[PDB]
């Protein structure tokens, strides 16, 4: 478990931002929402809920010689890149992505849910 | 018949610049040579054989997407400026060369046989 303490918290259901809150995590899920068993201390930022991007392609990146390169490379390679693409996306805060065309995703799927 | 008069004639087989000469053209063969029928004047310029080009590829012309366009493009269209490269090869002074690769070559020298 984990007791995580926002400074503020956005509320997506009705689009406000509220107060200083304490989230209770445990199996992986929120149990608790409280108002003002280790602590994370945030209270510094705004405390949001994960994106989610629902238009991406994690297996392709377009460059200047993006059509030479599919006569060329491999699938092997994509996935090779498709490893920090993945990385970069959630860092850079997105928690969920739809992907909406290629063969690569899938088993990057099966690979990420693996850990 | 054509009478063709050159000023200064260039001996290949030696190496040495000659005088006035005066070629007798027919059926597509040289027939005599006279030092000092049409009339051809080249009296101002200088007369020599046809060159050769041992090492042409005129199916090709290198380019910055020359490595692409070999899953694009079919050899109809190669045909299609191969005519202009070979007009502008027998422009420059070439009137015979070496093709060393391509499959468009042979149909080229057909076709430029039957006229």
Same mark, same amino acid.
């Given at each position: 478990? %984990?007791?995580?303490?926002?400074?503020?918290?956005?509320?997506?259901? &009705?689009?406000?931002?509220?107060?200083?809150?304490?989230?209770?995590?445990? !199996?992986?899920?929120?149990?608790?929402?409280?108002?003002?068993?280790?602590? %994370?201390?945030?209270? !510094?930022?705004?405390?949001?809920?994960?994106?989610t991007?629902?238009?991406?392609?994690?297996? &392709?990146?377009? &460059?200047?010689?993006?059509? &030479?390169?599919?006569?060329?490379?491999?699938?092997?390679?994509?996935?090779?890149?498709?490893?920090?693409?993945?990385?970069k996306?959630?860092?850079?805060?997105?928690?969920?992505?739809?992907?909406?065309?290629?063969?690569?995703?899938?088993?990057?799927?099966?690979?990420?849910?693996?850990?």
């Amino acid at each position: 478990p %984990v007791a995580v303490q926002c400074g503020r918290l956005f509320d997506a259901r &009705s689009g406000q931002l509220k107060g200083p809150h304490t989230l209770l995590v445990a !199996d992986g899920r929120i149990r608790q929402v409280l108002p003002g068993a280790r602590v %994370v201390d945030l209270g !510094d930022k705004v405390c949001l809920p994960g994106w989610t991007d629902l238009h991406v392609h994690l297996g &392709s990146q377009s &460059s200047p010689q993006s059509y &030479s390169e599919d006569f060329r490379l491999d699938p092997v390679d994509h996935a090779f890149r498709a490893v920090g693409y993945a990385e970069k996306t959630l860092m850079a805060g997105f928690t969920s992505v739809r992907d909406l065309g290629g063969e690569v995703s899938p088993h990057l799927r099966d690979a990420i849910n693996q850990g």
